[PDB]
Amino acid sequence: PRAPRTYSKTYSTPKRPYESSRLDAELKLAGEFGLKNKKEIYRISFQLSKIRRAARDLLTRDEKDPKRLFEGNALIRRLVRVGVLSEDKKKLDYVLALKVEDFLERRLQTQVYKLGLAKSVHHARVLITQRHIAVGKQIVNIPSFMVRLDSEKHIDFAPTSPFGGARPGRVARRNAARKAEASGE
Amino acid sequence: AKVHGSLARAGKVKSQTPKVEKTEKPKKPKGRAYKRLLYTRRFVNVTLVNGKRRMNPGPS
Amino acid sequence: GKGKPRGLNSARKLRVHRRNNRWAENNYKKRLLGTAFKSSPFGGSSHAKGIVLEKLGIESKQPNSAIRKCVRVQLIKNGKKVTAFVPNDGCLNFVDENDEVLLAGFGRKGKAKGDIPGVRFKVVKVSGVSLLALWKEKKEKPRS
Amino acid sequence: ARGPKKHLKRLAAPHHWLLDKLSGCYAPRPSAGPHKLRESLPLIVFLRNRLKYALNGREVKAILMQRHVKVDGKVRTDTTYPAGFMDVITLDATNENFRLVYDVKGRFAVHRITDEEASYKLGKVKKVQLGKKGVPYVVTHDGRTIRYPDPNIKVNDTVKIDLASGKITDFIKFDAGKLVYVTGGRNLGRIGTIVHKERHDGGFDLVHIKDSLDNTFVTRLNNVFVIGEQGKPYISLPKGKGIKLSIAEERDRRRAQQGL
Amino acid sequence: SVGFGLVYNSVAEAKKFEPTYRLVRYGLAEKVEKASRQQRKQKKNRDKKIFGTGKRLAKKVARRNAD
RNA sequence: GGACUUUUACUUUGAAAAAAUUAGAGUGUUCAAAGCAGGCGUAUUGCUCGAAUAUAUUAGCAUGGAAUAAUAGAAUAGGACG
RNA sequence: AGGAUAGUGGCCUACCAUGGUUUCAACGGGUAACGGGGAAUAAGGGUUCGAUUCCGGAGAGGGAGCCUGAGAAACGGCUACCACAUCCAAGGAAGGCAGCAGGCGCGCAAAUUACCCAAUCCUAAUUCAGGGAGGUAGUGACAAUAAAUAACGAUACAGGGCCCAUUCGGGUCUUGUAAUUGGAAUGAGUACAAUGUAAAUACCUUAACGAGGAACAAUUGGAGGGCAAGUCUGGUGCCAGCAGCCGCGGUAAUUCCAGCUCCAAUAGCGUAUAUUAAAGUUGUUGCAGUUAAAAAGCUCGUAGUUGAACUUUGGGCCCGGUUGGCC
C-alpha cells in the first residue's frame, strides 16, 4: 500500500538520569542560555554524538584515503557554514575539541540577546515565536535556529511585527478602542 | 500459623485525618519563565548558604 | 589452555557447546520453554481483566505484621484463579464484590513482593474506572 | 504467481528511475517491448519528470494521442512505451530530438540530437542464425530482425540501420581497441576504450575498458555497446562523455557553475 | 506566495486542455448535473441486474401485479 | 588450437549483489522532522543547479599472490627427457 | 522402456536391481515460526525482534474437483461434501468481509457505515468510461518534528557602583522585592475576505474583534539512602500503611496520611509487560572449574579438533611510482 517513510528520534539519555555533577552543569548551562528543557540539550548532544562518533571512523584510516578526504572536508564545511567552528580551528582533532556551549552560542536565542533588541534571553525565546524577529524574507518561529554564519546581519523585528512597525498591536488596538469609550461619554 | 484477619480497618488514617482544604496560592509561571525564576531562585537570591546550599532547609 | 577449542574449523563445536550452555540462563529458558504462554497467570500480557471473587486478609511475613487487603481473582480469558494486591490506603472500600477489576504486573517478574506473600498483582482499574482516579476521588465508582 | 505481475508498487522500480515516494504507491510500468523493464523509462517520465513539460499522465496521454510524439519514427501512443537504450525520439512540435543515453550515474540524460543524424539507428547484435527458407537473420539490442544481413556480421556486433527500413547500412565489427558505452551496472555510463578481452569459456566473456582519462575497469561482454572507433564515435555523446571524475570535482564544478 | 498561472492561445483551446474545476473556478464551466458516488454506483449495480430494453418485462412485472 | 593444465583453503581488486533503510553531500521546507528540491534575469511571451557519495559480508565469478595449512608425483621405477 | 506433462524429472506405469539418508545431528517432535530487505539496542563483536506500508511465498470458512481464458485449479468463478449461517409463500431459493467501511464476539487493546479519482498508477474497443486501488477528509497522545502558560516598569533596600564601597534616605545606569500601580508585545480563539481544495475542511494570509489573575491558572510523579530534593509542622501508632531493594511504620514516622517547602521531568510525565545495553550474569572477541557451581573414577578408544621441521634464499643489476629550503 502506502510507500514507507523514514523518521528519526533526535535525542538520547545517558546511562543515568540522576548524576548531580551532570544534572547541575546542564542546569547551569540551561539558565545561562535560557534553554527550554533538557530534551533540547539532549538533542544537541546527540547531534554532537554522531559527528564525534563519525570523527573516529573518519580518522581511523590514513590521511590519503579519499573517503577521509571527502568526509572530513564535507564535515568541516558544514561546521564552518553553521559557524559553531569558527573560520579558524580547521583541524579534525580541533573538531574533536568541540564543546556544547559553542552550539549553544550559535542558537538564535543566544545570538539575539548577544546583540540586544530583546533585553532578555527568556523574553527572547518567546519573542521569535511571538512573531517579532526576521531572519530572511519569512517570519521565523524558532529560537533554536543554528545560524549559518550569514543571517546575523539581518537580525531585526519581523515586518508584520509592530516592533517592525505598521501595527498598533493587540494591546494598543484594544486599549485605544476602549480609550474611545472611556475618554468621555 | 495464625490466619484470622480483619479487613474493615482499611483507610484508618484518611478517615481520622482532620482535613484542610487546599491553600489558594497565586499562580507561578511554567516552562520558559519558571525556568528563568527557578535558576534565579537557586543562584541569585540565595536563601540558605550555611556551609553549603541547603536546598530544602528547615525553617528556623 | 583455557579449556575451549582454538581451531579454525572448530566453530561447529563451539556453536553447539554454547547453545547447550545457554539453557541454564533463566531469561533464555522461559521464552523457549514458553512458560508464560504454557502456565502463567497471563501469557506475558501486561494487563488482564479479572473478576473479584472475595477479599482476603493476609498476614505479612516476618519481620512485618500487617494485613494486606488482597482479593482472589479469576481471569475471564483462561479461568485461572490467582490472588491480586491493592496498593494505597483503604481502597477495598472503593471496590465491591462481583465488579470487574483490571490487573497488570507487579513490577517484580513474578517473585511475590517483600512482606506480601503469594501475590504478584496490582489492580489499576475497577468497573472501568481507575483506582488512582478513585483514590484521588477525581471520579466516582460507577453503578454497574 | 497466477501469471505475470502487472502492478508494480513504487520503490520496486530500478534506481535510475529517481521517482519520489511522495507521488503515491505504484510506478509507471512499461509494457512488453523491444527492451527489458529494468533499464528503460517511459514516455511519461520524460514529459513530467525529465522535461518537466507535464504534471500528470492524463495530459501526457492527451499529447501522445495527438501524435506530436514519435519515438524512432513511430508515434506509438503507448503511455509507458519501453523507451530502451540509445533510441531516437522525434517531437514534431518544438521539433526536438533526444536519445536514450546515460550519464556516469547510469540514469537517463536528456540530450538534444539533430534530425540529420537522428534519422538512423545503431544496435548491438545479440544472435545471428538461419531462419526458415535458409534466410540469415540477426538479433540486436532492440531485437531487430534484419533479413539478408552481411555474411561477416557475427554475434555481439555493431550495426547501423536506416531506422525507416530494416536494412544493414554499415557494421562496426567487434574487435579490440575502440570506444565503448557500458550498458549495465555501476559501470553503466563509462565511455572508455577496449583494452582486450578474456574469452572465458563456459559463458560471460569479459573485457577490460580503459576510460579516456586513464581509468580501467573490466565488464561482461553483455554490458558493452560499441560506439564506433576511438576518438570518432558514431553518435553524439552527452555532457561529460563517460568519464567518472572523483566526487571532489563535482563539488568544485557546482561551485564553478553557480558557486563561482 | 508560490503559485502557477496559465495563458493559452485561445479560451476554447484553453478549455480543451484545462481541468474542469479550474474552469468552474472561473465560470468557464459549471457544476455538471450529477449525483453522488455511492448513489451512481448503486444504479450501476442496479443496471448490473438488467439486460435488454426491458419494457416487455417491465410491463410483465407490472402485469403480474394486476390480478 | 587451446593436442596442456596436482588440487586447493586463503587472500587483493573488480563485477553484480534491488529499491527503500542506514551513514552521509548539497539543500533558509522560516528551522526541524523534512523533502529532493532550486538559484537567478524588465519579471515583456526567461537563463539556469540539482536530484549526490558510501555502506548493502556470507555463497557463486574472473582476478595478482604463493607464505601460511593441507594434498600429491620416481623405489619390486611399470619414472622422466626424447 | 513406456506413458503423461508445454517439456526435463518414479511424476506415473511394466520389468529389473537393492538401493538411498545418517552422530558433519539424518529422521522425529515442538516452534506462542511466513522468509527477507530490514527494526531496536549497539565502542566493537553481538542479542533480540521482523505480522505488516518494499520483494518473494501462501490463503481467502476446511477440503477436494474443474470450466473459460495465453496466463485461474481463481474463490468480490463454479461444482460437491464438511461446518456455520439466511429467506421462505415450506414447495423452493440464496451465502461466503483475512478487500473498504461498519457491526458483534474476543481480549489489555485497537479509528468514520464521509468525499473524490484532483494527484499516483491501472484497464478497456481505450483522451472521453471507471477504479472503498489510491488519495483526500474523519477519528487518532502509535511514534516522531518545533514549541503557548509574559516581558517593561518601580515596591520599602532586604547588594561593589560612589564623596578611598560616604554615614547605602544619592537612580546602586544592575541584582533581587508586599497578589500595588500604567504603557508597549503576543496568540489561542473568532471570522469577513482572499490563499486553500476534485469541492472542500482544516493550513496560511488576513479584516474587525479577541487577556491583568492576561481565572485564557501545568501537570506528572518524588524528597533515610541508590537518588536530587524536608529530621518543616500536624494526624498517625508495627494498625493503617508505605517501600522496585535495603527497609520503615510502637505518639519524633525527615519514608505512612495531610499541609507548606523543595525537588526531577515537563505538555508530556508515571505504571506494567516483554526486550537489549549495562551483562566479562554465557564467554569468538571476553567466565570460572582446589575451597565460593562445577575436572568426568581411570584407561582405551573411534567420529571431531589440533598436528615436528625442512624444497629459490641471498647477492646484486636494470627499469620505475617521493617525499624538501636548493622552482
3-state secondary structure D113-172: CCHHHHCCEEEECCEEEECHHHCEEEECCCCCCEECCCCCCCCCCEEEECCCCCCEEEEE
Q: Which residue of A has its CA nearest to B44?
A: A31
Taking contacts as CB-CB distances below 8 angstroms, the residues of chain A near D17 are none
Alpha-helical regions (H) of chain C: 11-21, 26-33, 35-38, 131-135
Q: Residue C55: beta bridge partners?
A: C71
Torsion of CA D174, D177, D180, D184, to 10 degrees: 80
Q: Please tell me the number of Cα atoms within 13 Å of C70 on its side-chain side.
A: 24
CA distance D82 to D44: 11
SS (H, E, C) D101-119: EECCCCCEEEEECCHHHHC
Q: Under DSSP, is residue B59 helix (H, G, I), strand (E, B) or coil?
A: coil
CA distance C31 to C23: 11
Return the residue matching grid coordinates 578481452.
Answer: D197
Identify which of D89, D61, D99, D90 has the alpha carbon closest to the alpha carbon of residue D77.
Answer: D61
Query: What is the helix (H) or strand (E) element at residue D97, kind and residue range?
Result: strand D96-102
Query: Which nucleotide is at minimal CA–C1' distance from C47?
Result: G108
Contact (Cβ atoms closer than 8 angstroms) between residue D145 and residue D137: yes
Return the residue matching grid coordinates 561482461.
Answer: D220
Query: What is the helix (H) or strand (E) element at residue A23, kind and residue range?
Result: helix A20-32
Number of domains in chain C: 1
Task: Taking each helix axis as running N to C, give the angle between helix A66-82 and helix A38-59, from 0 to 180 degrees, rounded to the nearest 10.
Answer: 150
Q: Residue D129: beta bridge partners?
A: D137
CA distances (Å), origin A32, targets A12, A121, B45, C10: 22, 9, 16, 60
- Asked whether the beta carbons of residue D21 and residue A1 sit closer than 8 angstroms, the reply is no
- Describe chain B by its helix, strand, coil percentages, rounded to 5: 25, 0, 75
CA D21 to chain centroid, in Å, comes to 25
**C33 CB below 7 A from strand G atoms:** yes
Q: Under DSSP, is residue C102 helix (H, G, I), strand (E, B) or coil?
A: strand
What DSSP state is assigned to residue D41?
B
CA distance C48 to C69: 20
| CATH class, range D174-244 | mainly beta
Main-chain phi, psi angles of C105, to 5 degrees: -65, 165
Main-chain phi, psi angles of C74, to 5 degrees: -110, 130
- Asked whether the beta carbons of residue C55 and residue B7 sit closer than 8 angstroms, the reply is yes
Partner-chain residue, chosen from B33, B35, B40, that has the shortest CB–CB distance to A30: B35
Give the dihedral sign, CA D156/D157/D158/D164.
negative
CA distance A105 to A102: 5
Q: Which residue of B has its CA nearest to C70?
A: B7
CA E55 to chain centroid, in Å, comes to 24
In what order do the strands lie in the sheet containing D108-112?
A: D69-71, D88-91, D96-102, D108-112
Q: Does domain D121-171 have CATH number 2.60.120.10?
A: no
Contact (Cβ atoms closer than 8 angstroms) between residue E29 and residue E23: yes
CA distance D181 to D193: 9
Enter the C-alpha cell of residue C59.
498476614
- Asked whether the beta carbons of residue B3 and residue C91 sit closer than 8 angstroms, the reply is no
Taking contacts as CB-CB distances below 8 angstroms, the residues of chain B near C56 are 5, 7
Q: Under DSSP, is residue C75 helix (H, G, I), strand (E, B) or coil?
A: strand
* Cα angle, residue A55 at apex, residues A49 and A61 outer, rounded to 5°: 150
Q: Under DSSP, is residue E59 helix (H, G, I), strand (E, B) or coil?
A: helix
CA distance D126 to D146: 12
Main-chain phi, psi angles of C121, to 5 degrees: -145, 150
What DSSP state is assigned to residue A64?
T
Q: Which residue of B has its CA nearest to C68?
A: B7
Task: Taking each helix axis as running N to C, give the angle between helix A121-129 and helix A108-115, from 0 to 180 degrees, rounded to the nearest 10.
Answer: 120
CA distance A154 to A133: 10
Enter the C-alpha cell of residue D244.
567518472
Enter the C-alpha cell of residue D208.
577490460
Query: What is the helix (H) or strand (E) element at residue A76, kind and residue range?
Result: helix A66-82
* Amino acid found at D106: G
CA distance B8 to A171: 61
Give the dihedral sign, CA A91/A97/A102/A104.
positive
Region class of D107: left (phi > 0), else alpha (psi between -120 and 50), else beta: beta
Contact (Cβ atoms closer than 8 angstroms) between residue D23 and residue D13: no
Contact (Cβ atoms closer than 8 angstroms) between residue D197 and residue D207: yes
- Asked whether the beta carbons of residue A34 and residue B36 sit closer than 8 angstroms, the reply is yes
Query: Which nucleotide is at minimal CA–C1' distance from A73?
Result: F25
* Amino acid found at C117: P
Resolution given for this structure, in angstroms: 3.9
Taking contacts as CB-CB distances below 8 angstroms, the residues of chain D near A5 are 21
Partner-chain residue, chosen from A31, A125, A126, that has the shortest CB–CB distance to B39: A31
Enter the C-alpha cell of residue E33.
448535473
CA distance C38 to C106: 20
Query: What is the helix (H) or strand (E) element at residue D88, kind and residue range?
Result: strand D88-91
- Name C80's Cβ contacts closer than 8 Å, sequence gap at least 6: C41, C74
Torsion of CA A161, A164, A166, A167, to 10 degrees: 40
- Asked whether the beta carbons of residue C89 and residue B2 sit closer than 8 angstroms, the reply is no
Residues 38-57 of B with CB under 7 A from strand G: 38, 40-42, 44-45, 54-57
Buried b (16+ CB within 10 A) or exposed e, C33-57: eeeeeeebbbeeeeebebbbeebbe
What DSSP state is assigned to residue D16?
G
- Name A77's Cβ contacts closer than 8 Å, sequence gap at least 6: none
The count of other CB atoms within 10 Å of the CB of residue D147 is 12
Query: Which nucleotide is at minimal CA–C1' distance from A36?
Result: G147
Enter the C-alpha cell of residue C76.
475471564
How many CB pairs below 8 Å do chains A and D form together? 18
Enter the C-alpha cell of residue B34.
519558571
- Give residue B36's domain range: 1-60
What DSSP state is assigned to residue C70?
E
- Asked whether the beta carbons of residue B6 and residue C55 sit closer than 8 angstroms, the reply is no
Enter the C-alpha cell of residue D243.
568519464
CA distance D76 to D70: 7
Contact (Cβ atoms closer than 8 angstroms) between residue D219 and residue D106: no
Q: What burial class does residue D221 get, using C-beta atoms within 10 Å of its C-beta: 0-12 exposed, 13-18 middle, 19+ buried? A: middle
Write D190-195 long-range contacts (CB < 8 A, 24+): D190/D104, D190/D215, D190/D217, D190/D242, D190/D243, D190/D244, D191/D227, D191/D237, D191/D241, D191/D242, D191/D243, D192/D217, D192/D242, D193/D230
- Strand ranges in A11-152 using DSSP code E only, listed in sequence order: none
Q: For strand C70-75 and strand C81-84, is the pairing parallel, antiparallel, or unpaired? A: antiparallel
For chain A positions 120-159, those within 8 Å of chain B (CB to CB) are 122, 125-126
Contact (Cβ atoms closer than 8 angstroms) between residue D83 and residue D90: no
Q: Is the peptide bond before C63 cis (omega within 30 degrees of 0)?
A: yes
C58 touches chain B (CB under 8 A): yes
CATH number of D1-116: 3.10.290.10
Identify which of A109, A171, A102, A176 has the alpha carbon closest to the alpha carbon of residue A140.
Answer: A109
Contact (Cβ atoms closer than 8 angstroms) between residue D33 and residue D17: no
Counting every residue written for chain C, the total comes to: 144
Task: Taking each helix axis as running N to C, give the angle between helix B32-43 and helix A20-32, from 0 to 180 degrees, rounded to the nearest 10.
Answer: 110
CA distance A13 to C33: 35
SS (H, E, C) C20-35: HHHHHCHHHHHHHHCH
Q: Which nucleotides of G are covered by protein (CB under 7 A)?
A: 24-25, 32, 37, 41-42, 48-49, 53-58, 69-75, 106-109, 114-123, 127-128, 131-135, 143-153, 175-177, 179, 183-188, 195-200, 205-206, 208-213, 215, 217-219, 221, 223, 226-250, 253, 256-267, 269, 271-276, 278, 281-285, 287-289, 295, 304-307
Contact (Cβ atoms closer than 8 angstroms) between residue A36 and residue A28: no
CA distance D30 to D36: 9
Q: Which residue of B has its CA nearest to C95?
A: B10
CA distances (Å), origin D94, targets B55, C15, C96, D68, D89: 81, 70, 85, 9, 12
Residue with minimal CA–C1' distance to G283 is C18
Query: What is the helix (H) or strand (E) element at residue D100, kind and residue range?
Result: strand D96-102
- Give residue C9's domain range: 1-144
Enter the C-alpha cell of residue D95.
521539433
CA distance D250 to D230: 26
Q: Please tell me the number of Cα atoms within 13 Å of D216 on its side-chain side.
A: 4
Q: For strand D158-161 and strand D146-147, is the pairing parallel, antiparallel, or unpaired? A: unpaired
Residue with minimal CA–C1' distance to G234 is B18
- Asked whether the beta carbons of residue B32 and residue A31 sit closer than 8 angstroms, the reply is no
Number of domains in chain B: 1
CA distances (Å), origin C82, targets A147, C127, E60: 61, 19, 71
What DSSP state is assigned to residue D232?
E
Torsion of CA C55, C59, C61, C65, to 10 degrees: 130
Greatest pairwise CA separation for chain E in angstroms: 73
CA distance D33 to D36: 7
Question: For chain E, what is the radius of gyration of the CA atoms?
Answer: 22
Q: How far is C27 from chain B (nearest CA, A)?
A: 35
Identify which of D186, D189, D152, D175 has the alpha carbon closest to the alpha carbon of residue D221.
Answer: D175
In what order do the strands lie in the sheet containing D192-198?
A: D192-198, D206-211, D215-220
**A2 CB below 7 A from strand G atoms:** yes
CA distance A152 to D207: 57
Buried b (16+ CB within 10 A) or exposed e, C12-27: eeeeeeeeeeeeeeee
CA distance A78 to C136: 53
CA distance D183 to D84: 11
- Strand ranges in D173-233 using DSSP code E only, listed in sequence order: 192-198, 206-211, 215-220, 228-229, 232-233
CA distances (Å), origin A168, targets A126, A159, A162, A163: 19, 13, 6, 9
Q: What burial class does residue C139 get, using C-beta atoms within 10 Å of its C-beta: 0-12 exposed, 13-18 middle, 19+ buried? A: exposed
CA distance D28 to D44: 8
Q: How was this structure determined?
A: cryo-EM
Q: How far is D191 from chain A (nearest CA, A)?
A: 23
Residue D163 CA, nucleotide G19 C1', distance (Å):
64
